[PDB]
PDB file of C-alpha atoms and ligand atoms in Angstrom:
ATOM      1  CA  UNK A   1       0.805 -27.282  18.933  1.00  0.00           C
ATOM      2  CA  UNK A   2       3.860 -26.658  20.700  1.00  0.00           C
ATOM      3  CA  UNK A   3       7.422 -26.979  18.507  1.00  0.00           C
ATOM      4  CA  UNK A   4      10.751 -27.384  20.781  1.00  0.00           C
ATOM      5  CA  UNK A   5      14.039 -26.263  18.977  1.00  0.00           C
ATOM      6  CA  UNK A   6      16.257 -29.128  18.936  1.00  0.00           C
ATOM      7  CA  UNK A   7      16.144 -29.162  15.189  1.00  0.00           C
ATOM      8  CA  UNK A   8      15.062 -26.702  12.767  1.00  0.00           C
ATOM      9  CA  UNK A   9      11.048 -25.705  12.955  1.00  0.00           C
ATOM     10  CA  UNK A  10      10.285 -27.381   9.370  1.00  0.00           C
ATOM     11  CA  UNK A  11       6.626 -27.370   8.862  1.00  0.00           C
ATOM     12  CA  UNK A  12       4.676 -28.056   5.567  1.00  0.00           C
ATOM     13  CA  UNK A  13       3.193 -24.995   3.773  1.00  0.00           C
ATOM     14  CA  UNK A  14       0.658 -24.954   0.858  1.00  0.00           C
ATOM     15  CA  UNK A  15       1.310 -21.763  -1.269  1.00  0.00           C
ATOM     16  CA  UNK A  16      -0.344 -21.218  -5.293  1.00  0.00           C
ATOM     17  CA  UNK A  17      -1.599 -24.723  -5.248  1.00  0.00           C
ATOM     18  CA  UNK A  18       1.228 -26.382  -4.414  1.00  0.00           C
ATOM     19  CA  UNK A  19       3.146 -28.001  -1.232  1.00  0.00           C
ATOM     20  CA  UNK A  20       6.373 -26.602  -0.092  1.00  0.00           C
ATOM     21  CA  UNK A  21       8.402 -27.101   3.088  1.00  0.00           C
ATOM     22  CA  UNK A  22       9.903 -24.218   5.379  1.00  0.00           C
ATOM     23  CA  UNK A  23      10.808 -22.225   8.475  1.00  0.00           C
ATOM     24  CA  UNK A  24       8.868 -21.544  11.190  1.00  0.00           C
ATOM     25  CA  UNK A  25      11.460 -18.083  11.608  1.00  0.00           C
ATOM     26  CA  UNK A  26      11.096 -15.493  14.345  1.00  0.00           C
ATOM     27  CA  UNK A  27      13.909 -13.576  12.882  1.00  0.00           C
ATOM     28  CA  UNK A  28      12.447 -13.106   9.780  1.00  0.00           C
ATOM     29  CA  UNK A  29      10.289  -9.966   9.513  1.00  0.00           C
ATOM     30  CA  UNK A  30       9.311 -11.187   5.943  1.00  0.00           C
ATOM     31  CA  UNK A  31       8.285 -14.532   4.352  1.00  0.00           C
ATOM     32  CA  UNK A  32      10.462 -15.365   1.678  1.00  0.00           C
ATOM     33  CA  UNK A  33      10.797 -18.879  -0.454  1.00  0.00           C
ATOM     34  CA  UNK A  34      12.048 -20.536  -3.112  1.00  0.00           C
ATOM     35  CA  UNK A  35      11.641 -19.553  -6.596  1.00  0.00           C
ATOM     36  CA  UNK A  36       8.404 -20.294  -7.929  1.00  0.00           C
ATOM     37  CA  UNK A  37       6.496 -18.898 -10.752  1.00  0.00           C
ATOM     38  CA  UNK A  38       3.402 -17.449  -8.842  1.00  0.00           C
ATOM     39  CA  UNK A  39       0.824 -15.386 -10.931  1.00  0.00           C
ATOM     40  CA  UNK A  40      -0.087 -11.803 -11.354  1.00  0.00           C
ATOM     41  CA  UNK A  41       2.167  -9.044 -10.516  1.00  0.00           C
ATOM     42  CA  UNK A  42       5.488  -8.184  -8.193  1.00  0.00           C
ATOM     43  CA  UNK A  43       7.686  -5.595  -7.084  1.00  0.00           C
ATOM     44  CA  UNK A  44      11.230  -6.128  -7.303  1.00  0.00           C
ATOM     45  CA  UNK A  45      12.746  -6.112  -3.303  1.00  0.00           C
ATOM     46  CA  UNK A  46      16.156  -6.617  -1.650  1.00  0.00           C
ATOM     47  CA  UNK A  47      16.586  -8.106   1.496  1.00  0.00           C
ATOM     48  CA  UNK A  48      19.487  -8.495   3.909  1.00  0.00           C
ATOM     49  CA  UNK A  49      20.564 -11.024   6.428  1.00  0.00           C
ATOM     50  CA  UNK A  50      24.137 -12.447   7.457  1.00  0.00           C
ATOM     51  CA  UNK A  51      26.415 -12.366   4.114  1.00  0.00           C
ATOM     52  CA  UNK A  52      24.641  -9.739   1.927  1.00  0.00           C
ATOM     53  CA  UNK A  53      21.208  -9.268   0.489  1.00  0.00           C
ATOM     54  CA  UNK A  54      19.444 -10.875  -2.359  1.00  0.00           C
ATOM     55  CA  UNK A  55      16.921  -9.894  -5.038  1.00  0.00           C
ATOM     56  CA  UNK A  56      13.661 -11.096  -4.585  1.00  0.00           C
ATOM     57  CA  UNK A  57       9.641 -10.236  -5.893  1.00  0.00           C
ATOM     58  CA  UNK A  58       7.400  -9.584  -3.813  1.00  0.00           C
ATOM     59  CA  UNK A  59       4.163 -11.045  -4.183  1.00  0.00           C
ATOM     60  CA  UNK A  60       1.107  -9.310  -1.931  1.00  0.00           C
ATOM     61  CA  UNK A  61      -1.996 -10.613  -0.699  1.00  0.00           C
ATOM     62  CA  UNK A  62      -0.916 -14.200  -0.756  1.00  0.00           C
ATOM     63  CA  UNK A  63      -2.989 -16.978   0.221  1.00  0.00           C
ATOM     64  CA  UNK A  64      -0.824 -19.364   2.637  1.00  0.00           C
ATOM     65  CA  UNK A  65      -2.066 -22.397   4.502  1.00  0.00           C
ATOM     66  CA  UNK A  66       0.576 -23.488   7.381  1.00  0.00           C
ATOM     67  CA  UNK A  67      -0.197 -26.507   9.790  1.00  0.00           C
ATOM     68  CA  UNK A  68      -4.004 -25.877   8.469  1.00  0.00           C
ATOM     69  CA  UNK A  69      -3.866 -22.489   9.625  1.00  0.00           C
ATOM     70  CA  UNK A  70      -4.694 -20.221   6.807  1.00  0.00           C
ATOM     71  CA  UNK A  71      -3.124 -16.857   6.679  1.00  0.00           C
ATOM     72  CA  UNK A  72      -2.691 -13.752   3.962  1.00  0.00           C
ATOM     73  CA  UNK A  73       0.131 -11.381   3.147  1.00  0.00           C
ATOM     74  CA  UNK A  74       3.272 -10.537   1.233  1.00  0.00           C
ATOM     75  CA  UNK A  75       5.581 -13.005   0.169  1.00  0.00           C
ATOM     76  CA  UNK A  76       8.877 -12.259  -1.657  1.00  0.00           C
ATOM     77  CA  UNK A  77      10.299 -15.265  -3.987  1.00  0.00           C
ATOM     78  CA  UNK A  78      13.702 -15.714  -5.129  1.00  0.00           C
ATOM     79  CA  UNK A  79      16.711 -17.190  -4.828  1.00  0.00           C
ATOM     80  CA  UNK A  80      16.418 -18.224  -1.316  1.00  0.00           C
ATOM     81  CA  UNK A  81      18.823 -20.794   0.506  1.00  0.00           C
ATOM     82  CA  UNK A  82      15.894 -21.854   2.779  1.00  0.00           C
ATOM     83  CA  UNK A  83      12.344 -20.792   2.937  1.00  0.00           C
ATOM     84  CA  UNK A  84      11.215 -19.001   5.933  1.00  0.00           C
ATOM     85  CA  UNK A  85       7.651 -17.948   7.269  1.00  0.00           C
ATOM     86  CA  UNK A  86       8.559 -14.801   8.972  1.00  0.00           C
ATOM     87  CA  UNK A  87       6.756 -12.599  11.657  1.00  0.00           C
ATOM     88  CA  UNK A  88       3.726 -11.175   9.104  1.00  0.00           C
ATOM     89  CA  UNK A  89       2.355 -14.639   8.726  1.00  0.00           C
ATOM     90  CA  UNK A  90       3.236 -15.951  11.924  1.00  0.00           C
ATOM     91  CA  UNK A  91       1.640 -13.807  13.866  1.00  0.00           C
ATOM     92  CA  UNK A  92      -1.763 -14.715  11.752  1.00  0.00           C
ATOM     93  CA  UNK A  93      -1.571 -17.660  12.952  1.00  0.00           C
ATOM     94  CA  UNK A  94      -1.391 -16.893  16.347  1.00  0.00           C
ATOM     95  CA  UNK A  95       2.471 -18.097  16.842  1.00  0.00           C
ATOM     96  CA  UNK A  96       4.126 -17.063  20.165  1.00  0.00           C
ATOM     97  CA  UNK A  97       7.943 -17.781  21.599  1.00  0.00           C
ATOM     98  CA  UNK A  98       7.410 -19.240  25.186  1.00  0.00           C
ATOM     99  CA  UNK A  99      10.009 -19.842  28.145  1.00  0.00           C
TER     100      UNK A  99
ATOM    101  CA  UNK B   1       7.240 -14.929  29.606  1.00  0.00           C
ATOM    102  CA  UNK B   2       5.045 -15.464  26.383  1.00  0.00           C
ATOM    103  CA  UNK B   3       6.075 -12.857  23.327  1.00  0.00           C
ATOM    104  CA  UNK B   4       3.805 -12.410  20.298  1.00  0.00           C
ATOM    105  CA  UNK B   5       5.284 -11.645  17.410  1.00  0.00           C
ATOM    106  CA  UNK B   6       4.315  -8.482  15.771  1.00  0.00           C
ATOM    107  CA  UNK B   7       7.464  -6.842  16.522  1.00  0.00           C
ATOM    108  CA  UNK B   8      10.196  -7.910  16.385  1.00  0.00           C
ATOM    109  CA  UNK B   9      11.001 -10.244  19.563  1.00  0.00           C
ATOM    110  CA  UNK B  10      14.158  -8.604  21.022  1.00  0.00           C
ATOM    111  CA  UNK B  11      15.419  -9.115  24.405  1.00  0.00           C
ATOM    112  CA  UNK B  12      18.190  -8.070  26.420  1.00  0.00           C
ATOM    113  CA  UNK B  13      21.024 -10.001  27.035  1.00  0.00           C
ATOM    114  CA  UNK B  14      24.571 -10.312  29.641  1.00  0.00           C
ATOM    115  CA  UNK B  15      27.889 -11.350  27.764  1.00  0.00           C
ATOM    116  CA  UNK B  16      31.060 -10.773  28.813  1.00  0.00           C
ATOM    117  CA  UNK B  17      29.599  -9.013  32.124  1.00  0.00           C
ATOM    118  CA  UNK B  18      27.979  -6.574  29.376  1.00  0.00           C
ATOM    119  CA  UNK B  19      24.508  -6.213  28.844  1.00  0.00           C
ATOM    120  CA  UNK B  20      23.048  -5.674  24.740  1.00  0.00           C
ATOM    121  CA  UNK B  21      20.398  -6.388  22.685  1.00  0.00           C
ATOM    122  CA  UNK B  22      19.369  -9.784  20.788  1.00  0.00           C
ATOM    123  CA  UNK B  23      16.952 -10.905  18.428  1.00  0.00           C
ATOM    124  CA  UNK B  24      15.047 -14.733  19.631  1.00  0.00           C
ATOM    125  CA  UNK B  25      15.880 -16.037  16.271  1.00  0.00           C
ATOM    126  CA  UNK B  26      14.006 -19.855  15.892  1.00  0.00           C
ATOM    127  CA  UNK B  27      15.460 -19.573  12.200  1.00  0.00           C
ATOM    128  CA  UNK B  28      19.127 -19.539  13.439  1.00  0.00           C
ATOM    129  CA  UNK B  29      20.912 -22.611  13.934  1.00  0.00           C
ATOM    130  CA  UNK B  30      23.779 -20.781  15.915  1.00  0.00           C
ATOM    131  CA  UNK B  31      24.177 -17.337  18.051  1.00  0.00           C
ATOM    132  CA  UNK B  32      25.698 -14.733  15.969  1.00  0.00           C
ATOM    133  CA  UNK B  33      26.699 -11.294  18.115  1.00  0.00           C
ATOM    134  CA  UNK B  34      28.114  -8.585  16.161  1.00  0.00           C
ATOM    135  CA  UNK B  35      31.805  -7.485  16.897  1.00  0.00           C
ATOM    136  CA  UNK B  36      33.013  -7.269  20.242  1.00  0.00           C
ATOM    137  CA  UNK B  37      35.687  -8.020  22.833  1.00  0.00           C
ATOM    138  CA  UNK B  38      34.940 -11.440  24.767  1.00  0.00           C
ATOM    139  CA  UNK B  39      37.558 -13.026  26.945  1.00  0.00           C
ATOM    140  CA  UNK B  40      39.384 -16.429  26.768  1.00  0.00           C
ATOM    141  CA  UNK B  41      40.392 -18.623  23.433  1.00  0.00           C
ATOM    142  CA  UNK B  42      38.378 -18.730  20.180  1.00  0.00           C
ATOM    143  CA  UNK B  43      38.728 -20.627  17.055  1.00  0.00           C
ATOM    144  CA  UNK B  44      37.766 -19.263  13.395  1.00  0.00           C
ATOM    145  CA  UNK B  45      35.124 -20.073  11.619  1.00  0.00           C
ATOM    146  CA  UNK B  46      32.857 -19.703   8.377  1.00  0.00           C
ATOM    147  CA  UNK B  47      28.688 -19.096   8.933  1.00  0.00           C
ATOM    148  CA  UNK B  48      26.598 -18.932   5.490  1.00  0.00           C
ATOM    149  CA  UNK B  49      23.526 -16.806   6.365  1.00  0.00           C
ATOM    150  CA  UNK B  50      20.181 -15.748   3.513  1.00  0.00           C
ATOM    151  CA  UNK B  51      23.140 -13.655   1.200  1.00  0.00           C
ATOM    152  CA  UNK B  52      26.233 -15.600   1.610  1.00  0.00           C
ATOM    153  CA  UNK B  53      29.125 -16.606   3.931  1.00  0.00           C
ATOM    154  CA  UNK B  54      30.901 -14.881   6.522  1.00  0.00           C
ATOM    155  CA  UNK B  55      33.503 -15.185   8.890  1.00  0.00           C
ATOM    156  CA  UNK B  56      33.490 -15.407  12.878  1.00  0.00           C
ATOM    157  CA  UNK B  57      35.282 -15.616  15.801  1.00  0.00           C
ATOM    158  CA  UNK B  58      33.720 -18.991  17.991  1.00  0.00           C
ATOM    159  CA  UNK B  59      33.702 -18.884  21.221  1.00  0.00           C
ATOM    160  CA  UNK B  60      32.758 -21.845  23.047  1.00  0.00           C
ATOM    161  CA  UNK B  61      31.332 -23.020  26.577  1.00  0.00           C
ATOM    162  CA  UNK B  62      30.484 -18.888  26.882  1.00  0.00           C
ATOM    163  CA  UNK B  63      28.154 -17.762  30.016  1.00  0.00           C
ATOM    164  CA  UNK B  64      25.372 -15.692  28.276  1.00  0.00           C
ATOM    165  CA  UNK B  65      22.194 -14.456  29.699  1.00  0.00           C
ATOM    166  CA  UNK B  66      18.740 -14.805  28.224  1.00  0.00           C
ATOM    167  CA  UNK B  67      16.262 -12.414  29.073  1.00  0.00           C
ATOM    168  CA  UNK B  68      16.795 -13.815  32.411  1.00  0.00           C
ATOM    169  CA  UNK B  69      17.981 -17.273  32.137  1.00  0.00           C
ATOM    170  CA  UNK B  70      21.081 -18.717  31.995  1.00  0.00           C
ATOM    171  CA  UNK B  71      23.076 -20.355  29.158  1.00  0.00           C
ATOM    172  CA  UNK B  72      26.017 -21.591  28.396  1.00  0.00           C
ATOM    173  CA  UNK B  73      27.178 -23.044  24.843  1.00  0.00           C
ATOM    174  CA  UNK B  74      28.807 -21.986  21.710  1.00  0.00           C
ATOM    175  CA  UNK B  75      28.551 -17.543  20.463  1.00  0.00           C
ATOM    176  CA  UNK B  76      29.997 -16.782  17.493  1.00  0.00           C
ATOM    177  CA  UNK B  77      31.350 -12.965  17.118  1.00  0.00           C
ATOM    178  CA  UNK B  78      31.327 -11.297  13.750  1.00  0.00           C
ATOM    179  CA  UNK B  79      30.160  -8.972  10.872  1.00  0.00           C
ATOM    180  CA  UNK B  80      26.353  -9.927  11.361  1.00  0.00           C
ATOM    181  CA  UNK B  81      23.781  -6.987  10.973  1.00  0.00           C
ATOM    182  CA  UNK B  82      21.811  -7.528  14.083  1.00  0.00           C
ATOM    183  CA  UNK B  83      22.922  -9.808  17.430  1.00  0.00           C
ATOM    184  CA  UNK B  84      20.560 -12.936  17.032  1.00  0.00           C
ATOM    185  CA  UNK B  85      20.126 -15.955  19.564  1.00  0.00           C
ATOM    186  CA  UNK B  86      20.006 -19.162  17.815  1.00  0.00           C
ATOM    187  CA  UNK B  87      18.966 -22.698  18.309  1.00  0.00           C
ATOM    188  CA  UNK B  88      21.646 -23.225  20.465  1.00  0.00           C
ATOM    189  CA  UNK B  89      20.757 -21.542  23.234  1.00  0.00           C
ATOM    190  CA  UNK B  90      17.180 -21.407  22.784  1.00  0.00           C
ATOM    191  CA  UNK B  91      16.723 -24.092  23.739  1.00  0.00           C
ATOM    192  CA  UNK B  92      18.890 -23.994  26.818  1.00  0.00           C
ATOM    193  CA  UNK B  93      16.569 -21.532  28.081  1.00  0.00           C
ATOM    194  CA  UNK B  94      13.277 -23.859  27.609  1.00  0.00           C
ATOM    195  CA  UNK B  95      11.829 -22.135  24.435  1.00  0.00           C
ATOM    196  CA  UNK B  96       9.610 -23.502  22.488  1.00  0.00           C
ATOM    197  CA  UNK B  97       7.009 -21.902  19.673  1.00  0.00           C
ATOM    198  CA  UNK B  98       3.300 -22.682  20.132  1.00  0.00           C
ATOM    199  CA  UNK B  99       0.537 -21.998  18.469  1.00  0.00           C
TER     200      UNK B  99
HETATM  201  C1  LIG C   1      21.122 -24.551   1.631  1.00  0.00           C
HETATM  202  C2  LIG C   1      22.346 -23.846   2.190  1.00  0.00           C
HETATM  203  O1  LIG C   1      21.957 -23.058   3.291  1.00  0.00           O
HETATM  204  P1  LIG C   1      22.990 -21.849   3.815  1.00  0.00           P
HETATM  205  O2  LIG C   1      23.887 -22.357   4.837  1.00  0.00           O
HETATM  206  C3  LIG C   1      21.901 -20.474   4.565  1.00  0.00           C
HETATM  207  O3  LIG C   1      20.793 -21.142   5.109  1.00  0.00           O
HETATM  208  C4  LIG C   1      19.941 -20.305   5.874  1.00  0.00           C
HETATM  209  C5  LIG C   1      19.867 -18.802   5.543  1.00  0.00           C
HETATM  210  C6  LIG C   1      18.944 -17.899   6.359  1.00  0.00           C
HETATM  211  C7  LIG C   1      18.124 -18.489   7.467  1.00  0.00           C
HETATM  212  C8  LIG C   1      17.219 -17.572   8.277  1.00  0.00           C
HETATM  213  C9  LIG C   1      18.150 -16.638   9.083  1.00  0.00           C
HETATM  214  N1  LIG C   1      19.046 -17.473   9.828  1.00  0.00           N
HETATM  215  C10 LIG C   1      20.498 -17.294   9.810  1.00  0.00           C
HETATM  216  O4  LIG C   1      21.048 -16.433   9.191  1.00  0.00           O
HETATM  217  O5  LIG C   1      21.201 -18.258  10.639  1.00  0.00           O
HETATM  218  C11 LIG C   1      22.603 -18.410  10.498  1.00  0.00           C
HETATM  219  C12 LIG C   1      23.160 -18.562  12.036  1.00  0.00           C
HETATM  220  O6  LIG C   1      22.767 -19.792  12.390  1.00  0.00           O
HETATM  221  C13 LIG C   1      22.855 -20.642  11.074  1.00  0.00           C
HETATM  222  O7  LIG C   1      21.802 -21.330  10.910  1.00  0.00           O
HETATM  223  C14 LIG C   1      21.112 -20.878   9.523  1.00  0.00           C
HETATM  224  C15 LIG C   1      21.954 -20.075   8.894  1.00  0.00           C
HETATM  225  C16 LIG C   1      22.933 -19.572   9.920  1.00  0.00           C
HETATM  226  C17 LIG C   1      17.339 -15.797  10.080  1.00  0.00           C
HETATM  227  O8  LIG C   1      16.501 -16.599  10.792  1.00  0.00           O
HETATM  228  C18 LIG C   1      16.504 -14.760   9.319  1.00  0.00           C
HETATM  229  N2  LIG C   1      17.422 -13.763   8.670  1.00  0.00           N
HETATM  230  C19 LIG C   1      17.534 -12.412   9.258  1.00  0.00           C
HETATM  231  C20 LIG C   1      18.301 -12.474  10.582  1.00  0.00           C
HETATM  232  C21 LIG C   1      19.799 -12.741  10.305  1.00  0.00           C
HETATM  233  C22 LIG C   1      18.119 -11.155  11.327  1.00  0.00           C
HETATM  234  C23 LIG C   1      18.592  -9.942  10.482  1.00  0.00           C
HETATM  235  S1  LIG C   1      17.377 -13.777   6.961  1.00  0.00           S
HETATM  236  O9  LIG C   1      17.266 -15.135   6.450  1.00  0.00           O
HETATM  237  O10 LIG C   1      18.594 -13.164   6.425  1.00  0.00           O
HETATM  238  C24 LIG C   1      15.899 -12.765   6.550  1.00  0.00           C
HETATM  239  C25 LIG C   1      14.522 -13.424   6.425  1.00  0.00           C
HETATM  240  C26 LIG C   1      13.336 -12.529   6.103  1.00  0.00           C
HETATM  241  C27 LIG C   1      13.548 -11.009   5.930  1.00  0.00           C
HETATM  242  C28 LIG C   1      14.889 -10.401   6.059  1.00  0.00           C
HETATM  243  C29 LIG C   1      16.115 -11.288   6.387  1.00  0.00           C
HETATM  244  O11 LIG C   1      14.781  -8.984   5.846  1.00  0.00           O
HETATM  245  C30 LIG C   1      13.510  -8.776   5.399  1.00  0.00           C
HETATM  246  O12 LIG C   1      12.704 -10.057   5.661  1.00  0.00           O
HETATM  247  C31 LIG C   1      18.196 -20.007   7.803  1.00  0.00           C
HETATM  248  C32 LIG C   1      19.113 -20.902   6.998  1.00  0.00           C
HETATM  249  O13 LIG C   1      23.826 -21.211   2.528  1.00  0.00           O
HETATM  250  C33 LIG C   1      24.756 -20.213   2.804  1.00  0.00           C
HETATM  251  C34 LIG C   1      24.726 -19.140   1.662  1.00  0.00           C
END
């Protein structure tokens, strides 16, 4: 499909069994969302963006299902304003900017 | 032009007559450039990014250049760690993401 900008790119994920909403985010090199008590083991991470960084876990080898596209990889949980599928899942599903 | 994402999708840019470097950033409602001297009147303002809140200089109704095509809408000027093109002026430029 083809998503134009006029509001935020919201799209429905499915993460560790459950549903969550988030960001379709090109300027996000990582995938980060809200807090949620995923199993197994983390690494503690900081990450940085426009007023600071936060503490987050990362999580690796994820299974994440976005628009029915199924992808794989790190995600970091925490406390998170927003949650945002960032460039290592987007590009598994084959996402592209066009203009 | 089409751009994957598997780095990160910078582009260059003309501001001011000046030519940088900005990051297509669909998770941005607004386009945050880091400090810098731009003429005519601006306004302050507060911007709360992934760690917090910040303040900026907005500029409004500012000529900017996209990678090629032209824009012209609202920049806002302050302590952000990387120059990002938001919403606003992606979709001036016709940019959509597809997948
Ligand atoms: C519920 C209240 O929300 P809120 O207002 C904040 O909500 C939001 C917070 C963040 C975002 C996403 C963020 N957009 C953003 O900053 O946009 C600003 C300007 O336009 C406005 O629109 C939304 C906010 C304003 C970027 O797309 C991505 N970022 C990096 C980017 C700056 C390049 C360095 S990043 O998130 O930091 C990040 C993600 C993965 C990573 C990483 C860093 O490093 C490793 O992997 C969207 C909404 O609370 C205030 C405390």
């Amino acid at each position: 499909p083809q998503i134009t900008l006029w509001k935020r790119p919201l799209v429905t994920i499915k993460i560790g069994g459950q549903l969550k909403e988030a960001l379709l985010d090109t300027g996000a090199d990582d995938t980060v969302l809200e807090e949620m008590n995923l199993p197994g083991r983390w690494k503690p991470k900081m990450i940085g963006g426009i007023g600071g960084f936060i503490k987050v876990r990362q999580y690796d080898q994820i299974l994440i299902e976005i628009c029915g596209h199924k992808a794989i990889g790190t995600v970091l949980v925490g406390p998170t304003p927003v949650n945002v599928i960032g460039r290592n899942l987007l590009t598994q599903i084959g996402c592209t900017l066009n203009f």
